[PDB]
């Protein structure tokens, strides 16, 4: 029994995490084999001002180690340090990028070192509500499936509102945001209508079930709702991939739909459902289904 | 900015995991240089659970009856002996991973980050609270038994907790690493009850403190109070007395805003009366207690916005 917002463990990517020094800034990096990635704001053109720059200008440290950078390559906003070490911690990895909803860990660090993990997920407007100061550029996001870590996030800047934006391992932002000192504001969010219906699952699985009617509903009925309440739009798909949380509890999607219905129209009327007063959108069925399995790394 | 609940990296607790069996029992165990710690529980049947004796059971057992697993490799047994709730296996190998370590005994209100596992290997980690009532609001399954809570400040490792059992209510119970149970409980299956639980007034108001460092105030009023009318008006809603020594903890919190203890005990009166209106505080619609004033300091930078 129970029910909380789980990281990975960040054991393999500990192992990896190093600090970067270019001139006045420093922020971290990944390790990975003799190849060190960081945010390229490090160094705006960014090439112009990348070809003014030779291998000792940049300083990576791992641990009580200076590493030696012997060449440097820029792909997209990541900058590519080659080093003279490879790392004897290298995990089993893969560079994947994740879509709106996809949840993933963060290891937050600050001076190559690690300070904390936690759980989140890419909102449907690309920015991630994390916790971050200054010094944590370079942070990553990841999942694990068995033993290989597929690297999905590195941290680049916080927005006016204070969420955060990033770039995927190949530097490719996720969201219309750009890495410089502009005018750049979040876009409206919506709820994760499929990660909502998934912990709905999770409720009736540890025993709450006051919010379950009777009543069905159309994907069509219930995606005019959820436009009105800055749902996202449910799909064929959400509801596939709902197939074996809705067998497990025997209460079909288009069932659990009619609840959600219910709470958006009507609240919770002092009612909690796992500790909670609001509608929890950041677990995935997968989420759900493994923390409610017991999946090892 | 921001502000999650946040865990400790788990890299050094990794490894230390390793999976101990004796008989049809698997469960996990925590690996530091020559030694497995482990429940010891272990050594029971589920029949046996009802009023088990312990030095009864393990008189009868020798080394070779305990499989320990480390990874891909068994661990031998070279002895065994017994601390409270705790089994303490002599292995012949010292963790070549043994980082820097303390065991502590933590008190109600104290946070700490949990490395769920099965069969000796890791399967996430999240941060908890150790309830007023000695109880720990977990997320764990069958085999999960031997999983630990811990602290990490600077390279050294507070191990605080080693999980032992699910109560009828869905919340758990364990020990710290000497065998000493958290609570009135006992290692054995029995009519066993969570106490009525409560809410950490500390704890809430250090996260209040939070909130006002990330800028959102307006929860706050023009109104103080003295400590025991706080402690009168909040027990009517379960929360527990706020003693001189909160106080006390949470001067560095007030000294960096700028509002006393006791104006922030005003204002969380005034939320316990008038709940949130449809606003809510650091994304949460309820007063959230699994922050210590510690921990909020640590998170939240030194500037308020
Ligand atoms: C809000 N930041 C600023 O005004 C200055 N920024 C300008 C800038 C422009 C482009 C890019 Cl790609 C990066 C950046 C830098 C940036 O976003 N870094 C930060 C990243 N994450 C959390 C941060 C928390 C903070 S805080 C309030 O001190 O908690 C500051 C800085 C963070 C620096
Ligand atoms: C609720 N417990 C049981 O049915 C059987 N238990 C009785 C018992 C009595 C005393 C001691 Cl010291 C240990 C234990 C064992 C026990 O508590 N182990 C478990 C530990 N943590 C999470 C557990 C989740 C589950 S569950 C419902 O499948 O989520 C089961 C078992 C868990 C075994
Ligand atoms: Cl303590």
Request: charged share 15%; with cysteine.
């Given at each position: 029994?129970?029910?909380?917002?789980?990281?990975?463990?960040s054991?393999?990517?500990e192992?990896?995490?190093?600090?970067?020094?270019?001139?006045?800034?420093?922020?971290?990096?990944?390790?990975?084999?003799?190849?060190?990635?960081?945010?390229?704001?490090?160094?705006?053109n960014?090439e112009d001002?990348?070809i003014?720059?030779?291998?000792?200008?940049?300083?990576?440290q791992?641990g009580?180690?200076?590493?030696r950078?012997?060449?440097?390559?820029?792909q997209?906003?990541?900058?590519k340090?080659?080093?003279?070490?490879?790392?004897?911690?290298?995990?089993?990895?893969?560079?994947?990028?994740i879509?709106?909803?996809?949840?993933?860990?963060?290891?937050?660090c600050?001076?190559?070192?690690?300070?904390?993990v936690?759980?989140?997920?890419?909102?449907?407007?690309?920015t991630?509500?994390?916790?971050?100061?200054?010094?944590?550029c370079?942070?990553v996001?990841?999942?694990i499936?068995?033993?290989?870590?597929?690297?999905?996030?590195?941290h680049?800047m916080?927005?006016?509102t204070?969420?955060?934006?990033?770039?995927?391992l190949?530097?490719?932002?996720?969201?219309?945001?750009?890495?410089?000192?502009?005018?750049?504001?979040?876009?409206?969010?919506?709820?994760?209508?499929?990660?909502?219906?998934?912990?709905?699952y999770?409720?009736?699985?540890?025993?709450?079930?006051?919010?379950?009617?009777?009543?069905?509903?159309?994907?069509?009925?219930?995606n005019?709702?959820?436009?009105?309440?800055?749902?996202?739009?449910?799909?064929?798909?959400?509801?596939?991939?709902?197939?074996?949380?809705?067998?497990?509890?025997?209460?079909?999607?288009?069932?659990?739909?009619?609840?959600?219905k219910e709470?958006?129209?009507?609240?919770?009327?002092?009612?909690?459902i796992?500790?909670?007063?609001?509608?929890?959108?950041?677990?995935?069925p997968?989420?759900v289904?493994?923390q409610?399995?017991?999946?090892?790394?």
């Amino acid at each position: 029994s129970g029910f909380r917002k789980m990281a990975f463990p960040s054991g393999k990517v500990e192992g990896c995490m190093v600090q970067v020094t270019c001139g006045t800034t420093t922020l971290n990096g990944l390790w990975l084999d003799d190849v060190v990635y960081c945010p390229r704001h490090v160094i705006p053109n960014y090439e112009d001002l990348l070809i003014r720059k030779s291998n000792h200008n940049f300083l990576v440290q791992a641990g009580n180690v200076q590493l030696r950078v012997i060449g440097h390559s820029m792909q997209n906003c990541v900058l590519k340090l080659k080093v003279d070490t490879a790392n004897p911690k290298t995990p089993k990895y893969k560079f994947v990028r994740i879509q709106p909803g996809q949840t993933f860990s963060v290891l937050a660090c600050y001076n190559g070192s690690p300070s904390g993990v936690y759980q989140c997920a890419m909102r449907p407007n690309f920015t991630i509500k994390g916790s971050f100061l200054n010094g944590s550029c370079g942070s990553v996001g990841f999942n694990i499936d068995y033993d290989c870590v597929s690297f999905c996030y590195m941290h680049h800047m916080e927005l006016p509102t204070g969420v955060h934006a990033g770039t995927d391992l190949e530097g490719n932002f996720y969201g219309p945001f750009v890495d410089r000192q502009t005018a750049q504001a979040a876009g409206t969010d919506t709820t994760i209508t499929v990660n909502v219906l998934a912990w709905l699952y999770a409720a009736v699985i540890n025993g709450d079930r006051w919010f379950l009617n009777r009543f069905t509903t159309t994907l069509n009925d219930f995606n005019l709702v959820a436009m009105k309440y800055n749902y996202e739009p449910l799909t064929q798909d959400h509801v596939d991939i709902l197939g074996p949380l809705s067998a497990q509890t025997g209460i079909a999607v288009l069932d659990m739909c009619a609840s959600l219905k219910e709470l958006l129209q009507n609240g919770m009327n002092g009612r909690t459902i796992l500790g909670s007063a609001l509608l929890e959108d950041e677990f995935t069925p997968f989420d759900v289904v493994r923390q409610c399995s017991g999946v090892t790394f």
